[PDB]
Design a protein around this ligand. Structure first.
Ligand SMILES: CC(=O)N[C@@H](C=O)[C@@H](O)[C@H](O)[C@H](O)COP(=O)([O-])[O-]
Ligand SMILES: CC(=O)N[C@@H](C=O)[C@@H](O)[C@H](O)[C@H](O)COP(=O)([O-])[O-]
Ligand SMILES: [Cl-]
Ligand SMILES: [Cl-]
Lengths: 229, 229
């Protein structure tokens, strides 16, 4: 198979720039592809180079109204797994029905639903010419992500698995250690609240960074303000 | 003649607490009464004690989905005045059609459309038993506002009139000076970006404070992140 060559490519475009996650799950006040589309427009107009989005309907709305590169995931609980970020081939195939250029998935060491292997998911993604991001919680998971064929790794799940570093602030340590040890792009994702933290992450060698809640979750932004009173 | 008594009163409710402004005018990404309603819900669930909203549609939706106390304004240009925050009796009367418990209006030294005076507008607001907030730009405007019987004063317009202090950051100076000289509630409003600034304003004697863009304008939040890169 063949297709036409584009001038701009996702990894080149996010390099040293900000990716904005526009996510609002079913228990959140902005749950609606209409609203997540408006959030992406705002992120675009504020200088975001790419968007991270959850669910086929949000992804498709964001792509239409922004034309930005997208990192797509589907979050879904399964009874037989702790994994919820794009846990199976069923979610991978749903995401490949969208135009999102990259698909992130949980690349932790943990057991996946139906006893599926991460390599198969990663191979399915590459088979359709997409990119694969490995959301990880620890340094070894990141090191293994590279070996599995991932195009890039993200610290998304650090502090969100029981065996990774438990923290309320950005895991800069993980970032540094990934940078010493993998060749592929290391993206810093998780609990970036301020411009200073974002600069620090890129200063520490992050290829790019994702900021979600501190831009697109007004409830969380509000809480951070009211917590200080 | 008379109405039933409520336990909670807007000025009592906001004291020491955060007011969130949920505005998106027609050139902004989140422009939509539905979207402002959801933002207000988020803001509520984050601990906001009241909401400031622009226009009858936004106000009505926000009252409906949050039941929070609302400071209402209409922003509208007139070709015979530089004032746009609730400039005339027209806007006052439209706002009194809503249930908003407080109405903010420009109470600068400047001439209003049609040569209307601010005292008349305040008297109409009081005539229906509502509260009147004075958005000011200077110490003397605040002193005068109190003289006219405004129920509170806000530093909303410091840096948004040519004769007031030009800054890109919170006008703490003005806040301190007003707290020292006026007996009515002084509300810090304009360019609060961090919880640290919020605490500082309350620490300097602000009765309460308003934060808008740093919570509810994702574009301005994104910009602050991308500016640092
Ligand atoms: C743990 C988990 O499921 N994390 C993320 C999955 O995408 C998501 O909830 C988060 O908002 C983004 O990663 C961006 O991070 P932050 O900037 O919102 O902290
Ligand atoms: C000058 C002007 O028109 N100011 C305001 C009128 O209400 C409005 O645009 C602003 O968002 C709020 O005052 C809250 O302040 P901030 O927190 O958005 O800076
Ligand atoms: Cl939220
Ligand atoms: Cl915005």
């Amino acid at each position: 198979g063949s297709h036409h060559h584009h001038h701009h490519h996702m990894l080149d475009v996010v390099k040293g720039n900000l990716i904005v996650s526009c996510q609002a799950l079913s228990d959140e006040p902005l749950h609606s592809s209409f609203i997540m589309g408006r959030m992406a427009i705002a992120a675009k107009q504020g200088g975001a180079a790419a968007i991270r989005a959850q669910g086929v309907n949000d992804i498709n709305e964001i792509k239409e109204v922004t034309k930005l590169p997208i990192i797509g995931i589907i979050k879904r609980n399964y009874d037989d797994s702790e994994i919820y970020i794009t846990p199976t081939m069923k979610e991978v195939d749903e995401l490949l029905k969208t135009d999102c250029e990259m698909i992130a998935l949980d690349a932790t060491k943990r057991k996946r639903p139906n006893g599926e292997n991460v390599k198969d998911l990663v191979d399915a993604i590459h088979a359709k010419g997409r990119l694969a991001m490995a959301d990880i919680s620890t340094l070894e998971e990141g090191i293994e992500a590279e070996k599995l064929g991932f195009d890039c790794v993200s610290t998304t799940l650090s502090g969100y698995t029981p065996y990774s570093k438990q923290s309320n602030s950005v895991d800069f340590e993980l970032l540094e250690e990934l940078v010493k040890t993998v060749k592929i792009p290391v993206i810093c994702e998780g609990r970036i609240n301020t411009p200073e933290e974002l600069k620090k992450a890129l200063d520490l060698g992050a290829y790019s960074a994702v900021v979600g809640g501190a831009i697109t979750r007004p409830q969380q932004i509000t809480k951070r303000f009211t917590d200080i009173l």
